[PDB]
Amino acid sequence: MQYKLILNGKTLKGETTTEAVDAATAEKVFKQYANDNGVXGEWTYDDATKTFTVTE
């Protein structure tokens, strides 16, 4: 349910979570969140904790 997002950008470092039932939907939500935050870059995620990491 709770998917995690670690934003490790150049001017934005932090983490947020969302209630998603589908990992692809979660990824889309997080990418929308990231783009809306004005960031983007390399995506590395671990399903072990369901943590999506945005690295610049």
UniProtKB/Swiss-Prot annotation:
Localization per Swiss-Prot or TrEMBL: Secreted, Cell wall
Sequence repeats: 3-56
Domain of life of the organism encoding this protein: Bacteria
Name the UniProt record assigns to this protein: Immunoglobulin G-binding protein G
Taxonomic path: Bacteria, Bacillati, Bacillota, Bacilli, Lactobacillales
